[PDB]
């Protein structure tokens, strides 16, 4: 396959950033595309052999350079607010079959200032009792609100293991104040689980949100903590709240244990009597 | 040289055969590519047609190319909800030296799931600490109903999404609405959107069955050892009490 | 990672196991600075048994460099804690009084 890095990046206007594209199957044709929302999949510089590079349809503002048939760097010398888009690296053979291969893509966002970025706030809401009584299924809802930009990945974890089934994620975040220009987004995710599995107190559910923010290099000056790349989590234990469960059993058996220690101590004490007393008789 | 896709919008019930169309102006080509695209996650190659081939097959997906008319059609059989994506048609030239493909605009496809037993309901999730928001959940509604945005800026109402329980092959639709609001009651949260009259608004009172709870009970090893120690202590106490009673009565 | 601290804890599991995570050629663990474990390349996690035992101590991993910064692990699972609600104290008092009562009638008639 073809790997391009980084996945996400936030740039102050005027900086320089070089995305990296690499492959190991020694393709020959390489190219860069930028995909704009609702506009099209436009082309950037393309190179067919080592040392030769040609322009596409959007050449202005970009560098490329190819000296090794395995790598392709795309450099922005002075990032501009119009550079905000998603970039793909297309790699192919020449003449073999003509098949193309695309990378996972890279998101870029250019901001006039770095004040407006925020880390997400994550909360978890437990299923209602009415839903369990009515359908015998439970629905946990994770909310990640008040972050900007939307370089966010959401995931669920159960017992320290990721979960891929029964999880629905909103594909489009909601702007908190859609009337004006950029505002913090809100995102929601849902996880449905059979009522038997949720009502077990041992099960431990976690919602994780990975957020890609400023790097340590970038200066920070505001009073609040610098919003560096991080991961925010929220947890919840399975709970019955209806009847008999394991923990009550544990507490009861332990209380009985202590009571029987006390009782046996008393009984053997008085076994000392009428045994150390009849002995002298 | 120019690639056009028809009809750039598609919305079908599950299990319906699908025909997708891509046409190109220049017939002197050597390639053909069809790509899926989810909202993100890049492009996944589906297919490849050569200049020497009229048909191509891959699983439940089929495709034909008629170069003389300059057309290509993709046939999807027994559509599943997992096919909702954008489809792109791309072609590469035969002369010129450039090797630069010409991508089409793409066609978006959505396949609604088939709900055996509709059961629209509006539950209210219990609020967690460190949060001042309340959450109502609208779920298990028929795929024909469909929700709108809120009338006010304080209530945030997400869009309906499909959800798949792999454990017991369940398919469902969901929508979530949350807000600060002081009087944000789930009885009137869904008020821009027309929803079925038989909607189940569960009573505020809490009702539960313990029998369901007993089914999730299970054991650990430490509990087992504690129970065994208890039974042993009971045996030992019985033995001691027996000897002690006998000696007590002996003094009499 | 840069400031050492190469050792981390992996906690939530189906059972009560608590795992410790640290070159995949030889892993030397140190508890209170003494050799407590040698770990091969295939195995990666250092086990600590059930968390009901309240595993606590110094931990440090070493590969090819000059070991790592220490980590202090502390646990307090109240497997022995008792909810001293009204019911349990009432039961304890009732048991104590009845036991001492039967004991007292016995010893009274003995003398």
């Amino acid at each position: 396959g073809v790997t391009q890095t980084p996945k996400f990046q936030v740039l102050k206007t005027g900086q320089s950033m070089t995305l990296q594209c690499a492959q190991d199957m020694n393709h020959e044709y390489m190219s860069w595309y930028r995909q704009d929302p609702g506009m099209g999949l436009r082309l950037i510089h393309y190179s067919v052999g080592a040392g030769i590079t040609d322009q596409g349809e959007v050449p202005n503002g970009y560098n490329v350079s190819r000296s090794t048939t395995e790598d392709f760097p795309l450099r922005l010398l002075s990032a501009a607010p119009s550079q905000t888009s998603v970039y793909f690296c297309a790699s192919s053979y020449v003449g073999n079959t003509g098949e193309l291969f695309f990378g996972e893509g890279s998101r870029l966002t250019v901001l006039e200032d770095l004040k407006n970025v925020f880390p997400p706030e994550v909360a978890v809401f437990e299923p209602s009792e009415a839903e369990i009584s009515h359908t015998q299924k439970a629905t946990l809802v994770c909310l990640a609100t008040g972050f900007y930009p939307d370089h966010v990945e959401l995931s669920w974890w159960v017992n320290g293991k990721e979960v891929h089934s029964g999880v629905s994620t909103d594909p489009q975040p909601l702007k908190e104040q859609p009337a004006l220009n950029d505002s913090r987004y809100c995102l929601s995710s849902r996880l449905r689980v059979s009522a038997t599995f949720w009502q077990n107190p041992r099960n431990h559910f976690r919602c994780q949100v990975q957020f890609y923010g400023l790097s340590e290099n970038d200066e920070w000056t505001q009073d609040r903590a610098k919003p560096v790349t991080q991961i925010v989590s929220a947890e919840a234990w399975g709970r019955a709240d209806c009847g008999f469960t394991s923990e009550s059993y544990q507490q009861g058996v332990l209380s009985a244990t202590i009571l029987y220690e006390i009782l046996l101590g008393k009984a053997t004490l008085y076994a000392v009597l009428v045994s150390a007393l009849v002995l002298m008789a | 040289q120019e690639v056009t896709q028809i009809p750039a919008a598609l919305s079908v019930p599950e299990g319906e055969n699908l025909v997708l169309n891509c046409s190109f102006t220049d017939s002197a080509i050597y390639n053909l590519q069809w790509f899926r695209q989810d909202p993100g996650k890049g492009l996944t190659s589906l297919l490849l047609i050569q200049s020497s081939q009229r048909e191509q097959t891959s699983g439940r997906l089929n495709a034909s190319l008629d170069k003389s008319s300059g057309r290509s059609t993709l046939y999807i059989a027994a559509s599943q909800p997992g096919d909702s994506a954008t489809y792109l048609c791309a072609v590469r030239p035969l002369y010129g030296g450039s090797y630069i493909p010409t991508f089409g605009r793409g066609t978006s496809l959505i396949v609604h799931p088939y709900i055996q037993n509709p059961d629209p309901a509006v539950y209210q999730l219990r609020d967690s600490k460190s949060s001042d928001k309340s959450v109502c959940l609208f779920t298990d509604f028929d795929s024909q109903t469909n929700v709108s945005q809120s009338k006010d800026s304080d209530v945030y109402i997400t869009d309906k999404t499909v959800l798949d329980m792999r454990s017991m092959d369940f398919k469902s639709n969901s929508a979530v609405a949350w807000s600060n609001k002081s009087d944000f009651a789930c009885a009137n949260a869904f008020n821009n959107s027309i929803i079925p009259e038989d909607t189940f608004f569960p009573s505020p009172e809490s009702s539960c069955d313990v029998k369901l709870v007993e089914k999730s009970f299970e054991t650990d090893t430490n509990l087992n050892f504690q129970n065994l120690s208890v039974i042993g202590f009971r045996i030992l106490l019985l033995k001691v009490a027996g000897f002690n009673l006998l000696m007590t009565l002996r003094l009499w | 990672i840069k400031g050492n601290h190469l050792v981390k804890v992996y906690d939530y599991q189906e059972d009560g196991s608590v795992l410790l995570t640290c070159e995949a050629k030889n892993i030397t663990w140190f508890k209170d600075g003494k050799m407590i474990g040698f770990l091969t390349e295939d195995k990666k996690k250092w086990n600590l048994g059930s968390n009901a035992k309240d595993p606590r101590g110094m931990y440090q991993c070493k590969g090819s460099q000059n070991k790592s910064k220490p980590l202090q692990v502390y646990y307090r699972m109240c497997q022995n804690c008792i909810e001293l609600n009204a019911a349990t104290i009432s039961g304890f008092l009732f048991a104590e009084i009845v036991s001492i009562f039967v004991l007292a009638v016995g010893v009274y008639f003995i003398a």
């Binding site: 008999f244 059993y249 009861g252 058996v253 009985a256 | 009971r234 009673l245 009565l249 009499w252 | 009845v98 039967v102």
Partner: peptide, 27 residues
């Protein structure tokens, strides 16, 4: 569940001691 076992133990033992006291009373 375990409680019922324990209270049944207590009740039956109280019954037993009462019966033993009665037997010793007319022994």
């Amino acid at each position: 569940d375990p409680k019922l076992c324990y209270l049944l133990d207590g009740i039956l033992f109280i019954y037993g001691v009462i019966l033993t006291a009665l037997f010793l009373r007319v022994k």
